[PDB]
């Protein structure tokens, strides 16, 4: 079908030598693959649906002139979005980044009952409505 004369390459994919990233920011960084925690000030859950990859925080110092926050870390604002955990781990492995993976924390199903607010002999009865 695919008449292209393919070859065989039985080694793990690795593109660290062709991505142009300096050695300092490959072997010393620590990627963090995680599903962002819900912002506790809001009840919305639309920002907890994709996996992110962020890097370890590094020093920020005050600019002597204006007091602005300065950085020497080129990857400080880098956030990558991935559809699944396996996709994120694949991207980190081929770039030569050491990574920590945190399994998604999903809310457990809860048994809600408006009627329990007015129980005859249980402590779920509320004193105010």
């Amino acid at each position: 079908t695919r008449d292209t004369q393919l070859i065989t390459v039985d080694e793990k994919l690795d593109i660290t030598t062709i991505t142009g990233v300096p050695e300092e920011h490959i072997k010393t960084r620590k990627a963090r693959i995680f599903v962002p925690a819900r912002n506790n000030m809001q009840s919305g859950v639309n920002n907890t649906k994709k996996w992110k990859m962020e890097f370890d925080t590094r020093e920020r110092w005050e600019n002597p002139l204006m007091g602005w926050a300065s950085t020497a870390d080129p990857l400080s604002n880098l956030v990558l979005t991935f559809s699944t955990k396996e996709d994120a781990v694949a991207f980190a492995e081929k770039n030569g980044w050491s990574y920590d993976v945190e399994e998604r924390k999903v809310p457990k199903p809860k048994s809600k009952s408006y009627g329990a607010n007015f129980s005859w002999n249980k402590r779920t009865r509320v004193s105010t409505k």
Partner: protein, 432 residues
Amino acid sequence: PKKTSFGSLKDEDRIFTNLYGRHDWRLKGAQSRGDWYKTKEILLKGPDWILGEVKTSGLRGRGGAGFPTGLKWSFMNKPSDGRPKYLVVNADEGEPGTCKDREIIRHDPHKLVEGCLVGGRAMGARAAYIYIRGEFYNEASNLQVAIREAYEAGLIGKNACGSGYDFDVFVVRGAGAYICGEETALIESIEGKQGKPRLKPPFPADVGVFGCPTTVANVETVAVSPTICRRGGAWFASFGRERNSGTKLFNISGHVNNPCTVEEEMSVPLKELIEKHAGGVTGGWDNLLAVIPGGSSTPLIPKSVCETVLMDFDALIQAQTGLGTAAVIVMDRSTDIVKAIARLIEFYKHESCGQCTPCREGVDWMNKVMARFVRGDARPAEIDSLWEISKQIEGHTICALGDGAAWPVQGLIRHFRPELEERMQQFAQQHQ
């Protein structure tokens, strides 16, 4: 066969024979008028027979909703799950224009008490809590005195009427909230909390007062049950139209010559009821402007509709209103119809429990717009705005108080839009 015209009810068919309090209201007076007669035999026939009679009679709730009473009392006809079963009689009587429940308590406080026993027996309840308006202090006392006599005569309490059935009747007074007439808000008040209605589908027949099965029934609904059980459901069904069976108490107030409270057969023509019993409209049946046929909750209807409309649930529903509590409020042509309905919306803004959003904010919003329509300080385009705001309250609230505040506004804009617009032109040309 069936009848076509209704009214002219004979005194021998009336149930509240001491409505005007011209005979003894104590136990001896009640018994001489048939109350507490052969009550033991009613109890011994069991809940099924009592529930059957109410079903056959076609009785419907007299509190304002008009659900089939016989069908509503059968939810408590279930085995016991270990919890006590109670009956809550709704004597709050807070609907503007409504005074019927005051007379039953103050002048026949033994049909109500007997009704509790018969109604309680049907539901299998252990006791009845009667929630009476807090302003009705004197009426609550007569109710207590009658309850004391019933206890001393063995009619209630342990071994009620010699039937082996134990039933206690308690009276709990409110504290001045119209919302406590709502069945669930009444229950929350008995439990010591604010008068805030509960949500459904946890129904009072499953989780009610103290989290127990309960039935909330109006005083009139409960005060006619013993008579139906005696004279039969067939007798009661002989009055009114089909599905509107029974005799109904009426409060004719407002711009009538002789405002009064009378009993009359259901389906009675509205014109006949005012003319025959209330002495007609002030200035004859040509000074009539509009009528509120079922208390403030129901929309008004203009003179044109009042010519032939009949006082029953189905007929008034077809007239874009409701029977409600049968509290007829009559307004003549000297009335400021906009101002009359503005005061009703101010009433609902002072009686909103404040729990749910649409009536906490919406009713207070309708009140301010109405307060400007009265003065005409508004544009005609705000009438449709007021209509839409009304439809956002109706059906989106926990309880029907929100619905009862939307309907009066809708009635005003349905039949008297020309009056509202004219009021705005007068203001516009004056306050250039």
